[PDB]
With several copies, the nearest count.
Chain A
Amino acid sequence: IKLLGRSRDFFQQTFSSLEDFKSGTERLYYKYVNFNEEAIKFLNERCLKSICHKFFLQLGQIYHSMGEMSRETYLSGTRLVPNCPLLWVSLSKIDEIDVRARSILDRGLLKNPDDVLFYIAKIQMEIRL
């Protein structure tokens, strides 16, 4: 279906009919169904497995396009799922645009600690500014 939808969405939902009958698969179609209608479905689907971090992460982006909301999702998300640095990178890259952000980077760094991808976050966003 990924190769099929690579070059029709009418089949996608049709294939998604039998797909729900059985955060790997759900996120796939959710990512595909992205073309605010998702916010409903995503919320209903992400309330199933609450992985939860990717669920958190995906909805935020859709919220990012929709929305305040984005920051709220991030803050709740990070505490629940603190571990992936992808989240705190995004949250800090939010606050940054409107400095608070370094604290957000740094407050989470120590909770991890000493994985790699957080230091690069700090670096990578210390250059930009």
Chain B
Amino acid sequence: DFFTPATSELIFARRFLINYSLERSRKRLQKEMERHQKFNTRQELLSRRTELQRMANLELAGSQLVSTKPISAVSLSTD
């Protein structure tokens, strides 16, 4: 096992990540905590049931075609 040195420029990025990462994590945890306070279990346990029912229903809409090789990746845009 070694520690490899080099690439100061990348080193710069790690700092960026830390500034970005640390803030984001802090925000995330806070948000998670906020959810906890309300409780009111009844709403939630309804919600899961609804979700499961929704999942149960789903069916095909269409097929479609693309090529003559199997399709290795599909992705949806953020919108």
Contact = CB atoms under 8 A, between A and B. Distances in A.
Which secondary structure dominates chain A's binding surface? helix
B60 interface: yes
B60 A107 contact: yes
Interface string A28-53: 00000000000000000000000000
Contacts of B62: 99-103
B63 interface: yes
Q: Interface size bucket, A side? A: under 10
Q: Interface size bucket, B side? A: under 10
A91 to B, nearest CB: 13
Nearest to A101: B62
Nearest to A106: B63
Contacts of A102: 62-64
B13 interface: no
Contacts of A103: 60-63
Nearest to B59: A107
Closest 8 CB pairs of A and B: A103-B60, A102-B63, A100-B62, A103-B62, A107-B60, A103-B63, A99-B62, A106-B63
Nearest to A99: B62
Interface string A82-100: 0000000000000000011
B57 to A, nearest CB: 13
